[PDB]
Amino acid sequence: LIVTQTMKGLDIQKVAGTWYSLAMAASDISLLDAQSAPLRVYVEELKPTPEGDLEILLQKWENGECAQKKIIAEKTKIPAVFKIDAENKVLVLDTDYKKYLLFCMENSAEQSLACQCLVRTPEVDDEALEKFDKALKALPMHIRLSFNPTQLEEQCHI
């Protein structure tokens, strides 16, 4: 239960659409170190279901190539928290729907933790990056990556 920042008033339907993983951080280096690392995933689109589950389109480098993944985060009794089917919960820390979204993924244990700053456009948002860094300043992150606009328009951010 390491993360104690959640979005109050979250309307999950309003996060539907295109996002860019501007920045990522994790608790352990190995979670993001290699391009095939377990939590180095690049968000493409969020597709909230009518009953409040969250289908996720993303890219991940596997076996020497940029692969497409589709996964579903199921709703919980808490609007800002979803569970991935594999126990790994996803939490929405903050979002303004129109520009940025900060979320973390953590495992039930440790804990193991990865967070991203998502943005709507392939641009460096300094002010979403500051909110991201503010949110993680107490979290025990040991790796942090960010991407430039060119990489953001590339599959797997090459």
Q: Which residues bind ligand EIC (CB under 6 A)?
A: 15, 38, 41, 43, 46, 56, 58, 60, 69, 71, 84, 90, 92, 103, 105
Closest C-alpha to 133, from 40, 43, 6, 25: 25
Least distance between ligand EIC and beta carbon 137 (Å): 21
Phi, psi of 83 (to 5 degrees): -115, 135
Cβ–Cβ contacts within 10 Å for residue 77, how many? 5
Which of ligand EIC, its own copies, none binds 90 (CB below 5-8 Å, type-dependent)?
Answer: ligand EIC
Smaller CB separation from its own copies, 5 or 146? 146
Closest C-alpha to 13, from 75, 68, 71: 75
Which of its own copies, ligand EIC, none binds 113 (CB below 5-8 Å, type-dependent)?
Answer: none
- Token pair, residue 126, equals 């300094």
Least distance between its own copies and beta carbon 155 (Å): 16
